[PDB]
Nucleic acid binder design. Structure first.
Ligand SMILES: [K+]
Length: 108
RNA sequence: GGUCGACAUCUUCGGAUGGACC
RNA sequence: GGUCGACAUCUUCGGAUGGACC
């Protein structure tokens, strides 16, 4: 619904280079960039659908995006286990963000 | 009138902070 | 009370913009 995954991102590529390429789609998203791959969560599922049709290359019928002059394939169908692990990853990060301020109050 | 390539608004990355907004 | 890893403050090198401040 809200997720796509960019793979085969060239080595040494900074996160900003990845984020910039996705910004060209004109939709708001969060980005996690690990191990030459990047997960992308759009704000709503509808804009993800519209993002897919922009990445879709009708010549080879596959989703692609250019990064540093190279062609990177994107996945629209995430394996169930990978997505499940991913939402838990977020939940921890979000709760970690809120735990920070809570503990700061305790320091008083 | 004086000051300003050393002034402001917005803003990418990076760094340092804690609470921020409604 | 609600929303914030998608909230903000400060800051180095930059970008855009025009006036900014006394
Ligand atoms: K993400």
């Amino acid at each position: 619904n809200c997720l796509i995954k960019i793979i085969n991102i060239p080595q040494g590529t900074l996160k900003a280079e990845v984020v910039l390429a996705v910004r060209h789609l004109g939709y708001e998203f969060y980005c996690d960039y690990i191990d030459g791959q990047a997960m992308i969560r759009f704000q709503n599922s509808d804009e993800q659908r519209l993002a897919i049709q922009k990445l879709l290359n009708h010549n080879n019928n596959k989703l692609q995006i250019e990064i540093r002059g190279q062609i990177c394939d994107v996945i629209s169908t995430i394996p169930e286990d990978e997505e499940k692990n991913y939402w838990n990853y977020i939940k921890f990060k979000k709760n970690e963000f809120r735990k920070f301020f809570f503990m700061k109050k305790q320091q008083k």
